[PDB]
């Protein structure tokens, strides 16, 4: 059934997949797998894509066991520690290099929280107490340079001074803040709190829910919004099915985590009517669509967008009862096994594949911004609800 197809997908073939990565030369993993698989050793390494390899690890590790899984966790962990942290300014960089010299230095408050992520993880798996200190200290950076009177800022230079949100920008719109940098902090913080149980920290995590329910959430629409400019207004007008249904268990996950009755109660009702939302408007031949930006509907199957649609629907039957949620989940699923994963040697899984079914061959296999983080969470999640169909 499910889960087994799901955890062999795991074991057999995305960790011996990202294995073959592990960079014992230069440290950390390779940078860049091109579409035609063929393999750059030399490429830049984003942070974001090393924290997402380490969160990776440091939770495959936890879920099944298995030095070997260890051992790579704590080969990403020294590459972040040695050089991916701004021991000075604070934070963590964009970009190094491949020998880990900083390539670009820009600050991102997205990027940080990630670093966060896979930190208190990587403690929670090992638990080297030097992880959970980086984690605070992070935190802290966080906290002291990017939190304004109405909310995170978003995009800085090394030294903290205020730059174009370029990155996390859709279109041109590059907006000062997003709905993506306060999830991720939900993700993150919601992590360090798991791990330690600091109340500061659930504070700012407390505050993070809020925005997400009194700002960013649409209450007429169950949409959640995405770009916003200083005064949290809307600036464009992009519905991202993908981060809506991640949001919808990510904020249930937080609330668990804080173990709140009102906020889960309170949570659980909006999360379910968002979730009931995703699957009435953005499942379509048994796929999650991407997008709507403004009058026009992206349908291209984004591997990531499957992922968490597999995750999100499951939560949702958890807190409804709904087989509908159920059979979506399944479909999403089975639809990832024709279409999104690659049966070449050596691939794993395709970026984009169109609603035709044909893959984006412009898209790389693994770069800054696709990695084992998604899909490894999706199998694990998967595993650990112990629902199956």
């Not at 504070?203 to 959640?224: E, H, S």
Request: hydrophobic fraction near 35%; charged fraction near 30%; aromatic fraction near 14%.
């Amino acid at each position: 059934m499910m889960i087994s197809e799901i955890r062999q997908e795991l074991t057999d073939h995305i960790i011996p997949f990202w294995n073959k990565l592990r960079d014992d030369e230069n440290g950390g993993f390779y940078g860049y797998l091109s579409y035609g698989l063929e393999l750059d050793k030399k490429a830049d390494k984003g942070v974001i894509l090393h924290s997402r390899i380490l969160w990776f690890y440091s939770n495959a590790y936890m879920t099944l066991g298995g030095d070997e899984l260890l051992d790579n966790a704590k080969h990403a962990y020294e590459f972040i520690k040695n050089n991916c942290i701004d021991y000075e300014y604070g934070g963590v960089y964009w970009m190094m290099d491949f020998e880990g010299k900083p390539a670009d230095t820009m600050k991102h408050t997205y990027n940080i929280a990630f670093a966060i992520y896979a930190l208190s993880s990587y403690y929670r798996a090992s638990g080297d107490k030097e992880a959970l200190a980086l984690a605070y200290r992070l935190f802290e950076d966080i906290e002291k340079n990017t939190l304004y009177e109405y909310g995170y800022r978003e995009a800085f230079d090394r030294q903290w001074r205020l730059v174009d949100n370029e990155a996390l920008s859709e279109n041109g719109l590059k907006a000062d803040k997003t709905m993506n940098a306060i999830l991720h902090l939900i993700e993150a913080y919601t992590e360090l709190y798991k791990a330690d149980g600091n109340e500061k920290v659930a504070d700012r995590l407390k505050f993070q829910l809020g925005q997400m329910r009194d700002i960013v959430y649409t209450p007429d629409t169950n949409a959640l919004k995405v770009f916003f400019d200083t005064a949290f207004n809307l600036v464009g007008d992009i519905h991202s099915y993908g981060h809506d249904i991640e949001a919808t268990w990510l904020m249930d996950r937080a609330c668990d985590v804080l173990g709140d009755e009102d906020l889960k109660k309170q949570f659980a009702e909006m999360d379910l009517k968002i979730s009931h939302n995703i699957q009435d408007i953005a499942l379509e031949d048994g796929a999650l669509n991407n997008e709507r930006d403004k009058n026009e509907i992206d349908k291209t199957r984004v591997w990531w967008v499957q992922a968490e649609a597999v995750v999100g629907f499951i939560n949702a039957y958890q807190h409804s009862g709904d087989e509908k949620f159920l059979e979506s989940a399944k479909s999403v699923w089975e639809n990832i096994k024709e279409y999104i994963i690659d049966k070449r040697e050596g691939g794993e899984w395709y970026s984009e594949v169109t609603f035709d079914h044909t893959p984006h061959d412009y898209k790389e296999t693994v770069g800054p911004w696709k990695c084992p983080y998604h899909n490894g969470r999706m199998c694990m999640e998967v595993i650990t609800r112990g629902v199956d169909i």
